Amino acid sequence: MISLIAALAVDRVIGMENAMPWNLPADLAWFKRNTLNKPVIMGRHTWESIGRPLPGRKNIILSSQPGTDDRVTWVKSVDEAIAACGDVPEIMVIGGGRVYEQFLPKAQKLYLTHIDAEVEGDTHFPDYEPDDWESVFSEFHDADAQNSHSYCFEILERR
Ligand SMILES: NC(=O)c1ccc[n+]([C@@H]2O[C@H](COP(=O)([O-])OP(=O)(O)OC[C@H]3O[C@@H](n4cnc5c(N)ncnc54)[C@H](OP(=O)(O)O)[C@@H]3O)[C@@H](O)[C@H]2O)c1
Ligand SMILES: N=C(N)NC(=N)NCCc1ccccc1
Numbered sequence: 134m135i136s137l138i139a140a141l142a143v144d145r146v147i148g149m150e151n152a153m154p155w156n157l158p159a160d161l162a163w164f165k166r167n168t169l170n171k172p173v174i175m176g177r178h179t180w181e182s183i184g185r186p187l188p189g190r191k192n193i194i195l196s197s198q199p200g201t202d203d204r205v206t207w208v209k210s211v212d213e214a215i216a217a218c219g220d221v222p223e224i225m226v227i228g229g230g231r232v233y234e235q236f237l238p239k240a241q242k243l244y245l246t247h248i249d250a251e252v253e254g255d256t257h258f259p260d261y262e263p264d265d266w267e268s269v270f271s272e273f274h275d276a277d278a279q280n281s282h283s284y285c286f287e288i289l290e291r292r
């Protein structure tokens with residue numbers, strides 16, 4: 134199955150720069166636990182944002198242009214990206230907006246973090262209708278000494 138995992142601030146704004154509001158320790162821990170030892174598909178700009186391969190995961194980068202880092206696996210289409218994952222239980226799509234838009238219709242699961250912070254951004258998680266998805270896990274969390282904003286985790290399964 135294909136899953137999307139994303140962290141959404143207000144208005145569905147997304148980002149993966151190492152700065153607030155995208156570096157909440159609780160969300161980094163959630164991302165690690167739900168992606169470890171699974172292939173991760175990302176777009177070229179998300180690859181540039183992360184700045185290095187994610188350890189313990191097969192890293193698959195979407196780009197229309199030849200790859201620029203042989204440590205990871207580069208593909209030129211959605212179908213190629215999926216094929217590069219092989220026969221595995223779960224493929225994790227980790228961004229960004231353009232990539233989420235294409236894989237959302239192919240996804241069986243959504244792993245969403247909602248962050249109670251306003252941030253300016255040009256990129257958003259795609260709109261989806263809660264109607265087509267069943268919430269199978271949900272937990273709200275307050276801000277604390279490690280996490281400067283409140284946030285919530287949910288896992289949604291396609292009905
Ligand atoms: N300055 C600009 O013109 C510009 C444009 C877009 C994004 N950005 C920056 O990137 C941020 C995030 O954009 P984003 O989240 O949409 O990026 P993203 O999804 O992480 O990466 C998108 C890139 O992935 C590749 N890609 C996506 N779908 C593909 C497909 N079907 N086949 C082949 N390659 C595919 C393309 O790379 P290639 O470009 O290598 O083909 C595309 O430009 C923006 O907020 C902005 O900071 C800048
Ligand atoms: N943005 C996501 N794909 N999911 C998510 N919940 N948080 C991302 C956390 C993150 C991991 C690695 C590098 C930078 C940021």
Ligand code: NA
Pocket residue numbers: 167
């Ligand atoms: Na799991």
